[PDB]
Amino acid sequence: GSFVEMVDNLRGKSGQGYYVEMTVGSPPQTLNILVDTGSSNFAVGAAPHPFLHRYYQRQLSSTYRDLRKGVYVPYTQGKWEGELGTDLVSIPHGPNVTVRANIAAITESDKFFINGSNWEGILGLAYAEIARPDDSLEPFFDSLVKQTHVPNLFSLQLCGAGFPLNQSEVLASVGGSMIIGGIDHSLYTGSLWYTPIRREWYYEVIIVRVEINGQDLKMDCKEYNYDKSIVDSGTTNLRLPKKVFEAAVKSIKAASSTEKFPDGFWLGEQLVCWQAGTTPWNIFPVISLYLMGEVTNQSFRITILPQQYLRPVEDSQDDCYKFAISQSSTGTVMGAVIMEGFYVVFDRARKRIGFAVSACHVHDEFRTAAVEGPFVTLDMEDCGYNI
Numbered sequence: 001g002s003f004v005e006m007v008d009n010l011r012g013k014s015g016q017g018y019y020v021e022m023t024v025g026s027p028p029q030t031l032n033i034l035v036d037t038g039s040s041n042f043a044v045g046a047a048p049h050p051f052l053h054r055y056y057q058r059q060l061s062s063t064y065r066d067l068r069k070g071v072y073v074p075y076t077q078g079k080w081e082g083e084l085g086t087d088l089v090s091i092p093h094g095p096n097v098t099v100r101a102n103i104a105a106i107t108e109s110d111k112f113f114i115n116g117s118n119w120e121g122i123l124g125l126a127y128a129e130i131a132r133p134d135d136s137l138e139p140f141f142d143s144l145v146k147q148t149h150v151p152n153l154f155s156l157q158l159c160g161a162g163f164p165l166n167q168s169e170v171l172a173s174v175g176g177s178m179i180i181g182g183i184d185h186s187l188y189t190g191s192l193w194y195t196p197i198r199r200e201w202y203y204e205v206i207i208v209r210v211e212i213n214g215q216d217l218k219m220d221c222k223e224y225n226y227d228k229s230i231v232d233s234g235t236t237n238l239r240l241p242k243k244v245f246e247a248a249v250k251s252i253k254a255a256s257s258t259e260k261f262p263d264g265f266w267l268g269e270q271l272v273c274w275q276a277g278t279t280p281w282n283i284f285p286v287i288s289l290y291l292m293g294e295v296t297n298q299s300f301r302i303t304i305l306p307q308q309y310l311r312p313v314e315d316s317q318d319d320c321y322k323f324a325i326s327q328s329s330t331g332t333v334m335g336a337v338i339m340e341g342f343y344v345v346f347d348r349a350r351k352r353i354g355f356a357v358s359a360c361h362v363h364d365e366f367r368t369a370a371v372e373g374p375f376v377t378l379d380m381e382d383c384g385y386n387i
């Protein structure tokens with residue numbers, strides 16, 4: 001229904017991630033924590049670092065419990081090593097509960113904490129299967145549901161501003177909402193459409209068709225989910241498997257062919273700029289991803305605009321952007337590019353993910369993001385990849 005205490009509890013932007021305030025320990029130590037549906041550990045800075053202005057001080061918490069076990073995470077979007085323990089954890093703009101949760105106290109890191117970023121830790125919201133060191137380390141959300149009456153569901157509304165936010169603006173701006181234990185109807189318009197969670201590890205889904213401005217990419221649907229397709233609030237871009245990325249970029253270039261962009265732009269390395277207010281949104285195509293429905297032989301589509309896949313960056317008074325669609329060798333990743341267009345419901349209790357048009361998506365007077373259905377789609381289980 002309505003969860004006013006949790007609405008507008010996030011801050012951040014797609015390039016730096018979105019974070020929520022949490023407290024750890026007794027007395028409570030406040031930290032800003034990245035909301036990550038692409039991992040399953042709760043890990044916090046626990047030692048001084050040049051890019052952290054605060055960290056978890058275990059010696060100052062009366063409720064700290066040492067698990068006497070280390071944890072190592074290899075190079076991904078950095079690397080880190082830490083020490084496992086448990087403590088009492090709360091979310092100030094969250095459910096009014098305190099839970100005893102596992103915490104990885106980060107003692108050493110390399111390219112993990114980012115200069116200029118405001119988060120001090122990560123809240124991995126995915127399942128125990130991908131937790132480190134192994135699946136015996138209960139993730140935060142599993143603890144929260146086990147210890148309280150909070151329903152086994154959360155929903156995310158990530159809000160892209162549509163323009164660059166400077167150092168002060170990004171700290172003062174509302175970046176979105178994380179509703180723990182429910183769905184807030186103020187955060188979306190139209191209907192919610194659900195896709196099954198294929199398997200509980202990452203939030204894995206199945207894409208059954210892809211269109212660029214209504215034109216079918218016409219690839220074998222297994223290519224779209226090779227080797228998996230996931231929903232990840234901790235990835236900035238929409239990432240596509242190599243072969244799919246190559247086909248999609250060719251189609252996006254063809255649709256936008258009235259303007260030529262350098263190779264560096266399509267590689268996501270180089271910004272493109274236009275005179276203030278003159279970004280030619282209309283030359284760029286909409287992108288639709290069709291997802292398996294909950295009903296046999298039924299699918300639905302989510303449609304995003306260039307206002308989602310062109311990420312605003314500062315250069316001048318020009319309006320500049322980076323192309324936020326990129327190649328992957330680990331499957332499709334529906335990152336902040338996708339999520340900024342939609343209110344996303346992680347319905348763990350019913351093993352499904354819901355999408356609805358976000359009340360904060362950026363658009364223009366001529367086009368809007370969309371969530372539509374149903375469509376008749378056959379042999380959708382064949383779109384899933386095995387081995």
Ligand SMILES: COc1nc(N2C[C@H]3C(=O)N(C)C(=N)N[C@@]3(c3cc(-c4cccc(C#N)c4)cs3)C2)ncc1F
Pocket residue numbers: 014015016017018036037038039040041042043073076077078112122124131132232233234235236336
């Ligand atoms: C903490 O513990 C564990 N974290 C992980 N993760 C895997 C990483 C990764 O490659 N992705 C795709 C991901 N979704 N999350 C991780 C990170 C995201 C960011 C980050 C930085 C800047 C912007 C954004 C955005 N949007 C995200 C830094 S690390 C953490 N894996 C296993 C663990 F035990």
